[PDB]
Amino acid sequence: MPPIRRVNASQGSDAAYQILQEDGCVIVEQVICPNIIAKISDDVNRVMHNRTIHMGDLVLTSKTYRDELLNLPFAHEVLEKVFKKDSGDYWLNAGVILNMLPGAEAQRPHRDDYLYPVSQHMDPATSPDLMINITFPLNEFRHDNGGTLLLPKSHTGPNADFYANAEDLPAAEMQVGDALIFTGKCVHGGGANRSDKPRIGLALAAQPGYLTPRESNVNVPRDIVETMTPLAQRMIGWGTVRTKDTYGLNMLQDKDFHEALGLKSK
Amino acid sequence: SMPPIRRVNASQGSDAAYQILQEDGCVIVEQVICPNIIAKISDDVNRVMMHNRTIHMGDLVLTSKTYRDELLNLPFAHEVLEKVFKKDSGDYWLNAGVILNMLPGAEAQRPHRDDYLYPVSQHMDPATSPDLMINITFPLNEFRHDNGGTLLLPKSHTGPNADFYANAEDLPAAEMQVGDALIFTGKCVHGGGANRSDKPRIGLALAAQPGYLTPRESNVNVPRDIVETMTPLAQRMIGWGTVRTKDTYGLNMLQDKDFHEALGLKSK
Ligand SMILES: [Fe+3]
Ligand SMILES: [Fe+3]
C-alpha cells in the first residue's frame, strides 16, 4: 500500500489539505503546543469495548479543550476547505478520548461515513465529504501500541463491505503536538495495542451542519457555554449552521440561534 | 395531460395511502384527522395574529397544546412515515412544523423539489435513493385551486434533478377539506399556488426527515415542563430524544446514553 504522508503545520493548512484530497489522510506535525495537549490530558486523567475506553463530555471536562483546542486555527482552515463548497457550515459529530488499553484488538478496516446511510447512495469519487476525523495523540502513537491503521488513497473507490486486512495496513506514527487527519471515506481502523501501556488520543469528528451530531451538548450549563468563542459554540451545537445554499439549520424562533437566546460569547 | 392527484380515505388504512405515495410522490388522505382537532389548533394559531404574500409561522409547540398532543401523535401519519423511513433511514423527526398562511394575491411558486435544500439530494439518483423528506399539510380552511391550493405534478418523483420541471399554470391543485391532509415527498414536483380569492388560505405543514438530518427548527428553547407533558414519540419529533439509524446507531445522545435516560426527561 502507499505510505501515510506527512507535512509540518509550518507548511500551511493548504499543504495538509492537498495531501488529504490525494490520500484521504495526512499526518500534520507540530500542529499544536504539547503544553495544551498535556493540559487537556491532565484534565482528562482526573476523570469500554475491545479493551478501549471511549470518553466524551469533553466540554465539561477541560477548559483547555473548550478554549484552545476547539479554536485551533489550522484545524478550521482544513475543515473549511473540506466542507464549505460542497456542504456549508460544519460542527462536531463528537469529541472523544480514545484510551486503547493493552490487549485491544485491531478493528476491521472501514469507512467512518457508513454511520450516515446516504453515503451508500452517493458515488464516493464525487460525493461531499460527510466526516472529518482529527486525532491528537496524548501519548506516542506507534504501530506496536495500536496507532490508527490507514489505507492511503482508498478514499475514492466504491463503497464496500470489505476493504483490507488490518495486518496489511501501515500505522499512523506520531507525537504529542501532532495530529492525524482523515476523511469519512478513508479506510482505516484502530490498531492492536500489543504494548504494556495505554495508547491515548483525542479524536474530534467533524461533519456538515446538516448532519445530526452523535454527541449532544444541550446539557452543558449556559454559563459555561457563554465563555466560549462563537465558532466553538457552533462546534458543540450551540449555534446555527448554514448550508452551502445559505439555508439556515438549527434555528430558534425563525432566527439565528445566538440571537434567539441572547447567547453571549467571548 | 399530466396525471391527477390521487386520493384515498384514511379509513382504507395507511398501506393504501403509502402505496399511492410510492407510485405518485403524493397522495391526499381524506378524513385523516377529526375536524374539531384542527379547529382547536386553528383557535390557538389565530390567538397569535412574509414572502410573496405568504406568512410562515413556526414554533407550534409553544402556541398550541392540541398540536403537541393530538397532531404530533397522529398514528396514521406515523404509520406512513415509518413505511417511508424505517428500512432505508431509521428513526425520523421534524425538520420543521409551519403555518403557511397564504394571503390574497400570492403568486404560484416555481414548481420544485423540496429536497433541493439538502445538498446530498443532488448527488443521489432520484429513481433509487431514499426519501430525504416527507411533507404533510393539513388544511386549516378549504384548499381549492382558486385560493392557492398546493400544485403538484403526480409521478414526477423518480425523474432526474433539473432546473425546470413544469409551469405552475399547467398543474393540478390539491383540493381538500378540514380534516384531510396532503402527503408528498421531497422528490415530488410541487409549489404553492396562486390565491386569487379574497380570504387567506391557511395550512399546517409538517416536514419530517431522517433523524440523522439536522432539523431546521430547533426546539431547545421550549420550557422543559412543556416537553415533559408530551409523549416520548412527540418528544422525539421535536428533537427532545435520541434518534436511531437503520443500523441502530444512536444520534442526539447525551453522556453516551439515550437522551431521555441521561436527562431524567419525563413524558406523558
Ligand atoms: Fe472509525
Ligand atoms: Fe416546497
UniProtKB/Swiss-Prot annotation, chain A:
Enzyme Commission code: 1.14.11.-
Top EC class for this record: oxidoreductase
Cofactor: Fe cation
Residues the record lists as binding Fe cation: H110, D112, H188
Subunit structure, interactors included: Homodimer.
Function: Dioxygenase; part of the gene cluster that mediates the biosynthesis of anditomin, a fungal meroterpenoid. The first step of the pathway is the synthesis of 3,5-dimethylorsellinic acid (DMOA) by the polyketide synthase andM. DMOA is then converted to the phthalide compound 5,7-dihydroxy-4,6-dimethylphthalide (DHDMP) by the cytochrome P450 monooxygenase andK, which is further prenylated by the prenyltransferase andD to yield farnesyl-DHDMP. Further epoxidation by the FAD-dependent monooxygenase andE leads to epoxyfarnesyl-DHDMP.
Full protein name: Dioxygenase andA
Source organism: Emericella variicolor (Aspergillus stellatus)
